Amino acid sequence: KVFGRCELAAAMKRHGLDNYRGYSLGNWVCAAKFESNFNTQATNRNTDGSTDYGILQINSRWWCNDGRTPGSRNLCNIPCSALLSSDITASVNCAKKIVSDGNGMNAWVAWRNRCKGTDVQAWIRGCRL
Numbered sequence: 001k002v003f004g005r006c007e008l009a010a011a012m013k014r015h016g017l018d019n020y021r022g023y024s025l026g027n028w029v030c031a032a033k034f035e036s037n038f039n040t041q042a043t044n045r046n047t048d049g050s051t052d053y054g055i056l057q058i059n060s061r062w063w064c065n066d067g068r069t070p071g072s073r074n075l076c077n078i079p080c081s082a083l084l085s086s087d088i089t090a091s092v093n094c095a096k097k098i099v100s101d102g103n104g105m106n107a108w109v110a111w112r113n114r115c116k117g118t119d120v121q122a123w124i125r126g127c128r129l
Contacts, residue, residue: 001086003038003055005029006127008088013129015092021099025129026120027111028095032056033123034110040086054083054091056108063094075101 003011009029012018018025035057036042044052050061050069060069064080076094083091098107105111 001040003032003040005033005038005123006129008032008038008055009124009127010129011088012092015089017092017095020096021104023099023105024121026123027105027115029123030115030118030120031105031108031111034114035108040088040091041084043084051080053080054085055088056083056091056095057110058083058091058094058098063098 009025012028013025017028032038032055036055038055040055042054042057044057046052046059048061048070050059051066052059053064053066058064058076058080060066060072060080062073063076064078064083065072065074066080076097078090078094083094099105105116
């Protein structure tokens with residue numbers, strides 16, 4: 001499904017992402033906007049044989065298993081097809097692992113490029129939270 005901005009903000013807040021590891025809620029919403037345009041079914045194929053899945057475009061080389069990516073680690077221990085659900089819980093739980101790993105939200109290149117450095121609080125303004 002395609003989420004609305006405040007609808008996603010509220011779902012992510014319910015899942016404990018607001019200020020998780022130092023990143024306020026606005027960061028996560030902006031990341032989803034520019035990674036998947038708020039769509040749970042977005043997928044993106046990469047030159048190394050991996051694919052990015054779901055609303056947060058989680059990658060199959062390191063995080064989920066899709067059965068077709070060469071040096072796959074499955075550090076979230078989840079099949080990638082679960083990340084394509086309309087319900088974002090598996091994506092959020094794997095995103096919690098990714099941001100705890102090493103370089104925070106730098107794992108998301110659309111965040112890195114288009115969110116970081118802006119006032120990301122603007123992405124939850126006007127939302128009932």
